[PDB]
């Protein structure tokens with residue numbers, strides 16, 4: 001519903017070419033103000049497919065691989081190490097982080 | 099305020115108003131409200147004394163082991179020779195504990211009864227709630243907000259079980275608490291209660 | 296280090312693709328079915344308020360690539 | 363209980379009429395738990411809590427008011443000529459049956475002699491709607507200046523911006539004398555970096571800091587006299603909080619220029635928390651003169667786009 | 670089983686169950702700690 | 712779609728031509744009217760017995776798996792010296808008594824949460840909430856959940872929910888009996904279950920229980 005309730009219209013559809021904004025504004029030296037152009041900006045309505053359901057969460061079969069891959073990318077991200085048996089320290093690290 | 103066993107409901111006598119009210123009364127002890135307001139005080143005092151006790155029998159040990167300061171291990175600390183006797187300490191710890199505990203008794207009997215000094219009658223105490231005196235018991239004046247009271251009761255409930263753990267880790271183990279922690283961190287799956295028995 | 300970077304990227308951007316497809320299947324209810332609508336990253340906007348676990352998974356993935 | 367009379371006459375499903383400390387008051391509740399505290403017989407809104415977060419505590423207080431003083435705090439509409447026209451507290455409802463549970467509307471009504479100021483406060487799930495409409499009856503063209511001054515509290519004082527009045531010229535202009543003020547117009551323009559008369563400056567920043575005292579009206583109503591294109595200022599901006607991640611937007615209908623009022627450092631002398639801003643559209647720098655009998659429509663909508 | 674739990678709730682059935690459990694408890698304790706005349710655990 | 716529709720009265724019974732009892736209408740999965748004694752008379756107790764059957768069957772299924780599959784791997788040459796009825800006596804770390812109390816702690820947490828579900832269904836809820844998303848209220852023993860229904864097979868995706876719960880219960884009753892066979896014929900033969908199978912399949916006539 002509009003901002004006035006039972007005023008300004010019984011509702012308005014077919015809003016016309018309101019260039020003057022119904023202020024009866026007169027024109028100085030210009031190209032044109034009115035013409036043979038009568039085009040009404042007919043807007044759409046309300047109270048129809050009104051819901052527009054916001055994007056809710058997907059089901060368990062989507063989150064469950066994402067949870068397991070979160071557990072992977074937290075578990076692999078810290079891997080006296082297994083660097084040699086399987087197959088500048090602060091400055092370079094803070095330069096890459098910077 | 100929360101729940102200790104979600105399958106169970108908080109009883110009607112624990113309305114959540116009190117600090118630390120997780121609804122733990124399976125054995126129906128604080129069913130009468132007088133018993134509830136007495137056991138609030140018993141909890142607070144046993145927990146505060148347990149916090150002081152644990153802090154006075156563990157922090158000596160974590161400083162003895164690392165060598166910052168050598169001090170006895172809370173069970174060989176009685177037999178040490180002090181500047182007084184073994185019983186003179188009990189005499190003083192009777193004289194000037196009877197006075198402070200009976201005044202706390204008069205407080206937890208009627209709240210506004212005992213707040214001014216006998217000697218210096220001007221230096222009264224503010225009208226705080228029972229078990230939380232304030233005033234000179236709050237010199238830094240940290241506020242007694244309900245979150246702070248909950249933190250108090252949580253650390254106190256933890257220190258009570260910590261003291262019980264100390265007594266039973268010296269009764270059927272023979273060693274100190276922190277030594278038992280280092281023994282657990284040495285080999286946790288082989289230095290537990292089910293290896294001693 | 297090549298194989299270790301392979302492992303961490305192949306477990307990181309896989310999570311990122313599953314988070315992206317969760318974003319896409321959340322957007323399918325808004326825009327209907329169209330890749331210029333339901334895969335357009337411009338009009339996705341913000342989904343922290345709506346799909347939180349997708350947000351956390353996608354964020355841990357993109358921090359896994361951001362170092 | 364006059365509010366009980368309004369309840370069994372005009373009260374509806376989302377409309378709750380309240381009467382405590384002999385103050386008539388209504389609370390509007392649309393379906394998503396949006397609270398709106400409209401003080402009745404005053405045309406003055408106290409509180410407004412629409413669902414911002416997606417919790418049960420998604421409602422967040424938008425308007426600034428203190429706990430006790432209902433005359434000092436919140437958005438109140440004001441009409442002057444050049445004295446206060448609607449200071450009489452004869453506001454009464456006219457109709458309430460607007461929509462079931464999704465959108466609500468309380469329209470009030472008074473009479474200032476020649477001016478029949480009926481006044482709409484609507485509650486939509488995303489927006490407060492504040493709508494003024496006057497109606498002349500006598501044979502006198504009144505040269506009135508409407509005013510809807512809102513007071514939007516901000517959680518952190520550093521987080522203040524309007525985001526979108528760039529390009530249009532502004533002028534530091536002291537606000538209207540409201541009975542529901544927070545700061546008087548004498549102290550609203552005192553101890554700033556805009557000068558006291560209507561000096562002109564073009565805003566060259568997409569968002570303005572509201573840290574200083576510098577308070578102004580946006581738009582060029584001296585350009586409005588030309589009735590060319592005249593650079594009509596935008597009817598919308600994104601006021602921000604930045605203490606927590608939410609924002610709001612104000613939309614005017616029928617008005618021309620939009621006032622903001624920055625308390626600066628002088629918020630300490632009345633309140634102590636939740637720094638505010640005195641924001642709203644008026645027809646002030648050029649007033650409105652309706653007719654010897656016509657009606658004028660001017661609406662203002664504060665909306666949120668978080669939900 | 671309805672009305673069997675009421676029978677097993679009856680005083681003699683419940684007494685024999687309680688005292689059988691209790692007697693087995695005492696019996697196994699006396700197997701574990703036979704010939705007891707003091708409480709030395711403190 | 713997800714209603715847990717029961718079985719009809721003209722369902723197959725454990726004993727054809729017999730009258731099913733009135734307390735086994737068919738609301739539970741695997742309802743074939745088996746009640747010669749009638750231990751499920753009280754429905755408030757039959758709910759507990761249905762939960763009992765469900766958990767008993769699930770544990771028996773995991774157990775029969777952990778007995779026969781690892782024995783197949785031992786026959787394939789993966790695990791050494793495998794014998795399930797001597798796999799508790801053999802050596803591990805933690806002495807098998809520290810393992811027991813750690814097991815009791817962790818399973819006490821798990822089965823206590825399940826108990827709190829049984830006493831009061833909504834107490835220990837999981838599958839955390841999402842905006843404008845209504846996680847469906849589950850039943851006792853079939854929590855659904857992100858942790859126990861991540862493939863969303865419980866609400867009735869591949870097959871209806873009743874026939875899937877009946878599949879669980881029937882496969883699991885069979886597993887309960889398989890584990891009873893394990894506990895009995897590993898002590899009256901002092902041998903391996905798969906060995907006993909191949910021994911009976913060698914000569915089904917004379918390699919039966921009556922030989923021993």
Ligand code: CLA
Pocket residue numbers: 695698699703704705706707
């Ligand atoms: C009333 C007189 C009387 C008294 C005082 C006793 C006393 C005793 N008799 Mg005799 N007796 C009596 C009558 C009596 N008897 C009669 C009438 C008969 C003929 C029926 C006998 C025939 C008899 C035989 C044939 C034997 C005894 C034995 C014993 C001893 C019991 C040792 C035992 O198993 O307890 C151990 C303790 C218990 C069983 C109590 C355990 C209780 C449970 C576990 C709970 C406790 C823990 C609890 C939770 C609290 C913990 C605190 C906290 C952590 C919560 C004890 C000296 C036995 C013995 O050793 O000879 C000396 C023995 O062989 N008696």
Ligand code: CLA
Pocket residue numbers: 725735739740741742743744745746749750751752757760761762763764767884885887888
């Ligand atoms: C943990 C065991 C257990 C439990 C609690 C249940 C419980 C239930 N079953 Mg299930 N069932 C089981 C095992 C179990 N069943 C197994 C192993 C089979 C295959 C043999 C079946 C086959 C079956 C059918 C075909 C049907 C049921 C049905 C029922 C329901 C009604 C009966 C009742 O209340 O009995 C309660 C039972 C107990 C409390 C357990 C009995 C314990 C006593 C002490 C006797 C144990 C000794 C036993 C005879 C030893 C076996 C010897 C060996 C030679 C075979 C109830 C939900 C009916 C239903 O509606 O389905 C949902 C139904 O139609 N059950």
Ligand SMILES: CC(/C=C/C=C(C)/C=C/[C@@]12O[C@]1(C)C[C@@H](O)CC2(C)C)=C\C=C\C=C(C)\C=C\C=C(C)\C=C\[C@@]12O[C@]1(C)C[C@@H](O)CC2(C)C
Pocket residue numbers: 122123124125126127143144145147148149150151152153154155171172173175176258259261262
């Ligand atoms: C006060 C206290 C300890 C104080 C210790 C002090 C001063 C120690 C001092 C010393 O160490 C030093 C500093 C230095 C050493 O040289 C000397 C000594 C002297 C040795 C412990 C209380 C310790 C108190 C304990 C352990 C209480 C445990 C209570 C429990 C578990 C209650 C459970 C329940 O009651 C509820 C909560 C609710 C009911 O409904 C249900 C049930 C289940 C019944």
